[PDB]
């Protein structure tokens, strides 16, 4: 039982060299979504704004598949995120290193998919002038891979709406919109596409 | 002697691989309980408040047990928390990563049960507006597992009154109420429950 979970965790990670990242020949799709919970700080003296959110990532590796009855009918398991490869999905316009606010544990399932939603706090670039008006401001921050083009890592959203069903009521900022938009860019030089999800939120001071 | 202790610690940890966490085949019950020492700071400008507390946590594994009459009449021992599986209980509305203020050492008693009480400082989302009076504010934090549902980790509390017998006398706030109440919950979609201990504190400046 726990026998089988232990032996399966010992049937994917030692006996297999860790995965070397996706390539143009074996690309990888990474579906990404946001779950926003507060706008903790704003700083018009420097135009940092701090968000607290959940960043949900999901991808699929064949080096992680198994046969469920060959291991006690185990459909899925939880594991520390350090045990597995994870994509380098990061914020293009941060101003401080991200702080991690939660454990970093992932679920790997018998077909071989990880899902991993850690809680973070991000300082990024935004002009807040207008927070107190009745239009608010509009900030944006882009999120993409840092070394992989659209030919190695494809980015995806399962919705354009940022899950707000858990935004802190008594926050000091009301959210008017919360968008998460896959955007494909090309460059004059290069055939391969570069992907990102633009996370733009319009928001207001509490009135 | 301490040589007996050293052998017991070796037999448990050295040739038996570590617990891979609970499955619903073999679920786990984890009891919580806070011991609040101080409300250190409110920030009326960001809507965060900082608590120093103790998180007592208990659980029980058939793998951490042994027969004392084979290890020199040893009832129990103390060990670094890094040497054992520890549950992933987490504040869902934290704002800055939690700071540990104590050693992380657990007591394993011979029936496989475990207790473990780190000291922590936590920053979470809370409106302090109205902490310039008497009736006071209340705000709350839900603690719960990050990847485990009620079919895996059954959360629980013994008492539902936060222990206040060691709160700081001269603290710049003082507490009126302080409860730790378990909450179960389901989602329209999904059969498994989702548990969380809700910690809620009514407090106000000293007079």
């Amino acid at each position: 039982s726990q026998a089988n979970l232990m032996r399966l965790k010992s049937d994917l990670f030692n006996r297999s060299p860790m995965y070397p990242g996706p390539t143009k020949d074996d690309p990888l799709t990474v579906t990404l979504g946001f779950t926003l919970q507060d706008i903790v700080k704003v700083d018009s003296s420097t135009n940092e704004v701090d968000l607290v959110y959940y960043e949900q990532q999901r991808w699929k590796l064949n080096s992680l598949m198994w046969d469920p009855n060959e291991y006690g009918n185990i459909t899925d398991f939880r594991t520390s995120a350090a045990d597995i490869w994870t994509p380098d999905i990061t914020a293009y316009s941060s101003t401080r290193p991200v702080q991690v606010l939660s454990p970093q544990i992932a679920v790997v399932t018998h077909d071989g998919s990880v899902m991993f939603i850690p809680a973070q706090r991000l300082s990024f670039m935004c002009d807040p002038t207008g927070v107190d008006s009745e239009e608010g401001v509009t900030c944006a921050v882009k999120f993409g891979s840092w070394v992989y083009s659209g030919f190695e890592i494809d980015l995806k959203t399962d919705t354009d709406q940022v899950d707000l069903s858990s935004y802190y009521a008594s926050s000091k900022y009301e959210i008017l919109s919360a968008t998460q938009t896959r955007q494909v860019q090309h460059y004059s030089c290069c055939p391969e596409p570069y992907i990102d999800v633009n996370l733009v939120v319009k928001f207001r001071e509490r009135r | 002697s301490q040589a007996n202790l050293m052998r017991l610690k070796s037999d448990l940890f050295n040739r038996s691989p570590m617990y891979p966490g609970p499955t619903k085949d073999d679920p786990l019950t984890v009891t919580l309980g806070f011991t609040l020492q101080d409300i250190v700071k409110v920030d009326s400008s960001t809507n965060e408040v900082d608590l120093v507390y103790y998180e007592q946590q208990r659980w029980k594994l058939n793998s951490l047990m042994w027969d004392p009459n084979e290890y020199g009449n040893i009832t129990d021992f103390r060990t670094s928390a890094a040497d054992i599986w520890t549950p992933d209980i987490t504040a869902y509305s934290s704002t800055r990563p939690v700071q540990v203020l104590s050693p992380q050492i657990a007591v394993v008693t011979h029936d496989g049960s475990v207790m473990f009480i780190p000291a922590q400082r936590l920053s979470f989302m809370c409106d302090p507006t109205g902490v310039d009076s008497e009736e006071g504010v209340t705000c709350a934090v839900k603690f719960g597992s990050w990847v485990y549902s009620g079919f895996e980790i059954d959360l629980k509390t013994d008492t539902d009154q936060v222990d206040l017998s060691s709160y700081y006398a001269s603290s710049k706030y003082e507490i009126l109420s302080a409860t730790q109440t378990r909450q179960v919950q389901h989602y329209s979609c999904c059969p498994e429950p989702y548990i969380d201990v809700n910690l809620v504190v009514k407090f106000r400046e000293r007079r």
């Binding site: 979504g33 779950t35 959940y54 949900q56 999901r58 939660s102 992932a106 679920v107 998919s113 899902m115 991993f116 939603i117 809680a119 399962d158 899950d163 069903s165 858990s166 | 719960g144 597992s145 990050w146 990847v147 485990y148 549902s149 989602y187 329209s188 979609c189 999904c190 498994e192 989702y194």
Partner: peptide
């Protein structure tokens, strides 16, 4: 309304 909560968000990719 699950995806707002991490343990179920990872339990239910189909929904989230």
């Amino acid at each position: 309304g699950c995806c707002s909560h991490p343990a179920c968000n990872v339990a239910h990719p189909e929904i989230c």
